[PDB]
Design a binder for this molecule. Structure first.
Ligand SMILES: Nc1ncnc2c1ncn2[C@@H]1O[C@H](COP(=O)(O)O)[C@@H](OP(=O)(O)O)[C@H]1O
Ligand SMILES: Nc1ncnc2c1ncn2[C@@H]1O[C@H](COP(=O)(O)O)[C@@H](OP(=O)(O)O)[C@H]1O
Ligand SMILES: Oc1c(Cl)cc(-c2cc(Cl)c(O)c(Cl)c2)cc1Cl
Ligand SMILES: Oc1c(Cl)cc(-c2cc(Cl)c(O)c(Cl)c2)cc1Cl
Lengths: 290, 285
């Protein structure tokens, strides 16, 4: 197992990362942003795809047709993603006409300097740690490039130690929470989108300086609902071959709820996790709902 | 598959039972008890072996050498198992009888002769875990399915010997009588000395520090786990594949926390309340 992780991951700037990405990190380091670039940042499996489609719809005034012109991972390039010449986020962005929407899972400390220098707006989305752990576990099982996660308890231990891609979820959300105090960095919660999607959609429309009409909001709401996105080949990653994403084992649009952790954490693992969580987050005003 | 699951079982008087036992059930119901017979009754996986060895040691005044003259399932016949009835019929008194039968199904002869009975119960969650591994390792059992699936079966009493809830509630009522000693696995775990002394007095034996000392040492989990007379290792893998899961598995209280998800635990507790809130019987998980 530890050997598996050693083969699959490597650190960059002290953060564990997919080895393929690290090989060409210089391209990420020197990435050139544009003033109107919009960054969507998240710790893995926090609802990136969901908010990305909401944002894309807002950019297209809710035109569903314009949102299916290409798959989501081509419409919204994954900044640091690189797999030799098979996948290249920086290349996709470089050739992309503005306004560009950039997806990234990088903690603030690793975001390319250009983005800060150009004062680009950023939307950060987070989700409670327990549900993120469950979602990430299945991701490890379905997606190529990951070591065997082993049992759920084993995987959760590594999660608690930040020994997974992008490092510590705890440090990730806390660092972005600080950046979120800024007006140009909108800090959102997955659970808030679940509880009152209308409120969050209207919040996003205003953040992006667009006009919130009843018709636009309505289109966004049903189009970005879990069931619709799960069936939408543009947003469900099903165009990817099984060797890349084996959705037969687990679909990308898995369950889309808050609280699935209760179906995976044993009572003992939950007790241990909560204790560790409290130590990690006690000194923070950031509060999540499970 | 439900079909494959129940193919291994057959109901007898309302409770699911190992098909082989049922074939000879008339012999069980017609069993002839003796006045000095001692019955050790338990729902499966509640510590039967543990309390059986404690009782045997008391009968043998703590003579460890005597407790190893034969394997436990021969020293203390499993009444309804088949050949328990034969072993008992051919055994000299005083006889110690092991059984997992609810009080309503205990052979009439035992009640008619007013035999002493020791009943041992354990919290439902830990019993479910212990029983789950028993299914995986013991022949005669179908695939228990996933743990959540097995727990569902357990809650519905769709396992050998039926409803744990009805089993413990009925025996609790019988336990009100001074003739039926009602014990808890958790009590043996928390203060074995207290329970051993209680057992010695119940069995009208003279307690001594030596006797108590010997029993406590001899009946510890580690000792019994390594003792071939009590760990069921003499049975071939075909009968009991302990490579999959040993009979003497963990011997603790609370292992349920390592198996029940938060969701399953919540569902189980809700169901538990509906089944037990009217009983004065109180546990500890
Ligand atoms: N429209 C939507 N509504 C709710 N959850 C959604 C969603 N689109 C994606 N998700 C969930 O977001 C997670 C994927 O996150 P990301 O896009 O950051 O990789 C998955 O969580 P689950 O695995 O818990 O179902 C997925 O089901
Ligand atoms: N001396 C001892 N101390 C504690 N637990 C014991 C024990 N001997 C057996 N057990 C436990 O009693 C259970 C078997 O019960 P029975 O004899 O009725 O079939 C097993 O529980 P676990 O599976 O939880 O470990 C087993 O480990
Ligand atoms: O959000 C994502 C994260 Cl964190 C990682 C990958 C991802 C997918 C494949 Cl197939 C890989 O080989 C690697 Cl190294 C990363 C994809 C997405 Cl969409
Ligand atoms: O306590 C026990 C219970 Cl409930 C069942 C068996 C048991 C063991 C085997 Cl190998 C079988 O084929 C059957 Cl049908 C029951 C053994 C013990 Cl010791």
């Amino acid at each position: 197992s530890e050997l598996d992780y050693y083969e699959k991951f490597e650190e960059v700037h002290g953060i564990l990362m997919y080895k393929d990405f690290v090989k060409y990190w210089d391209n990420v380091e020197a990435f050139q942003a544009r003033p109107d670039d919009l960054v969507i940042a998240t710790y893995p499996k926090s609802g990136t795809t969901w908010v990305s489609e909401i944002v894309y719809m807002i950019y297209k005034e809710g035109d569903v047709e314009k949102c299916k012109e290409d798959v989501i991972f081509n419409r919204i390039p994954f900044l640091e993603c690189r797999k030799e010449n098979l996948m290249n986020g920086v290349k996709q962005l470089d050739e992309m006409n503005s306004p560009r929407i950039v997806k990234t899972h990088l903690p603030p400390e690793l975001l390319p300097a250009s983005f800060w220098e150009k004062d680009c707006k950023i939307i950060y989305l987070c989700r409670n740690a327990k549900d993120v752990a469950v979602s990430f576990y299945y991701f490890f099982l379905m997606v190529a490039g990951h070591p065997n996660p082993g049992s759920f308890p084993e995987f959760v231990e590594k999660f608690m130690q930040g020994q997974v891609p992008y490092g510590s979820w705890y440090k990730h959300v806390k660092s972005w929470w600080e950046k979120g105090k800024s007006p140009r960095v909108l800090f959102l919660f997955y659970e808030d989108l679940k509880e009152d999607i209308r409120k969050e959609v209207i919040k996003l429309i205003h953040f992006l300086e667009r006009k919130p009409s009843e018709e636009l909001v309505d289109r966004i709401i049903h189009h970005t609902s879990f069931q619709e996105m799960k069936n939408n080949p543009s947003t469900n990653y099903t165009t990817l071959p099984d060797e890349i994403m084996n959705q037969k084992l687990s679909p990308f649009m898995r369950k889309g709820i808050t609280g699935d952790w209760k179906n995976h954490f044993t009572v003992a693992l939950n007790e241990k996790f909560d204790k560790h969580y409290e130590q990690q987050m006690k000194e923070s005003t950031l509060k999540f709902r499970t």
